[PDB]
Amino acid sequence: NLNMDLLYMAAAVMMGLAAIGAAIGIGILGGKFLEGAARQPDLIPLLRTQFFIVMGLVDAIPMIAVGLGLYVMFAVA
């Protein structure tokens, strides 16, 4: 019935937007990591450390949205 026709679109959007968000966020965040590394190599272990520390907090909402999108696209639909 009509449910099959809207959910596969709603999830589509709900996850494409999170894609845009996480992609641009991580691109920007990693750009400064690379410039810092090229500026002062051998600090790379420390930059990588605190980069991954921060990056973990960037994925939160995008990944929540991905999870709920899938929870809809299959378990609801």
Question: Is 5 among the catalytic positions?
Answer: no
CB neighbour list of residue 22: distance below 8 Å, 6 or more residues apart: 58, 59, 62, 63
Kindly state the tokens that stand for 44: 């790379």
Give the active site residue among 59, 68, 70, 77: 59
CB of 48 or CB of 71, closer to other proteins: 48
For the four alpha carbons of 35, 36, 39 and 41, in that order, the dihedral sign comes to negative
Q: Residue 2 or residue 39: which is nearer to other proteins going by CB?
A: 39
CA atoms of 5 and 77, how far apart (whole Å):
10
Closest approach of other proteins to the CB of residue 39, in Å: 7
Shortest CB 77 distance to other proteins, Å: 55
The residue (of 41 and 56) whose beta carbon lies closer to other proteins is 41
Q: Which residues are catalytic?
A: 59
